[PDB]
Amino acid sequence: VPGSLVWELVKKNNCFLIKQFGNSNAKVQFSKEPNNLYNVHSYKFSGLANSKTVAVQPSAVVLSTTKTKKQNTPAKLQHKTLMRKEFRKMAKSVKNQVCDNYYRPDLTKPALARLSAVYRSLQVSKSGIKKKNRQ
């Protein structure tokens, strides 16, 4: 079952999709799944309708990519790496496992953006926010 077929089955309703404000122009949608970098309900970003996916979540930052020949076996579907180095070294590994490999090069900018937000979130976790970012 290819990703295009899976997308049409899960597009309308989903255990991870959150919809709000009805079906007018007011509608706001998001996705809750991991391996969904921007948490957006779209084919490009969906963690359910794509064979190759990247997950950038904290724990230390865990990067996870899925194996294409292990779709039928969920227990071995995720190849996970845990990195505790400096940001640039982590940013280099994300570019290596996502861009240079040709494993979803279209996600290299969303993945680096999410790694920035996750690393920044961890930065303030150890030392509380001493300045607010309104400028």
Partner: protein, 187 residues
């Protein structure tokens, strides 16, 4: 103020998508939307339009029609119908034909394959004939329906052979006073 009808807007309606919700048909529509955008083929443009059509606008085609429309031109020619291929017991010889259709009956699929032919889907015809080269586009009989027999002029006007809507058939069901000269008139 400018003198126009309905403001100049188009009042005719047409289908720009299939009314059905079949995901495999939605995937066919996406594929053929791409083909008519970037190949500019007249054949692909017709396929996309018929993929939107309703059930009564895509009549079934039988084997008898197919084996006669594809008579000598069954080598290097794929028959294309946007609809269903049904079987026909009234014929005995079935040549080897390449046929693509939305659906085959299990008797028609068996008849084609046993004769040496192939049954293709429209996603397979796109690989073989991306621009529809060396193909025969076919349609079933649009007006071979019992409903169409009641269409047209009213049954009670001269020169009309429209079917009436009668609950039963017999001598006591609409055969007197309007159907023969011995009772009034005969329209």
């Amino acid at each position: 103020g400018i003198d126009l009808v309905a403001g100049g807007r188009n009042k005719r309606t047409k289908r720009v998508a299939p009314k059905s919700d079949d995901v495999y048909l939605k995937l066919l529509v996406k594929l053929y939307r791409f083909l008519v955008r970037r190949t500019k083929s007249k054949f692909n443009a017709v396929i996309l339009k018929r993929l939107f059509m309703s059930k009564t606008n895509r009549p079934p085609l039988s084997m008898r029609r197919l084996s006669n429309f594809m008579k000598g031109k069954e080598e290097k020619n794929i028959a294309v119908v946007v609809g269903t291929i049904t079987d026909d017991m009234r014929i005995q010889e079935v040549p080897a034909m390449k046929v693509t259709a939305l659906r085959f009956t299990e008797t028609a699929r068996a008849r084609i394959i046993n004769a040496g032919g192939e049954c293709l889907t429209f996603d397979q015809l796109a690989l073989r004939a991306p621009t529809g080269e060396n193909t025969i586009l076919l349609r079933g009989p649009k007006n071979a329906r019992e409903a169409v027999r009641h269409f047209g002029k009213a049954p009670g006007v001269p020169h009309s052979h429209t079917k009436p809507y009668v609950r039963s058939k017999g001598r006591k069901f609409e055969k007197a006073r309007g159907r023969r000269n011995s009772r009034g008139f005969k329209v």
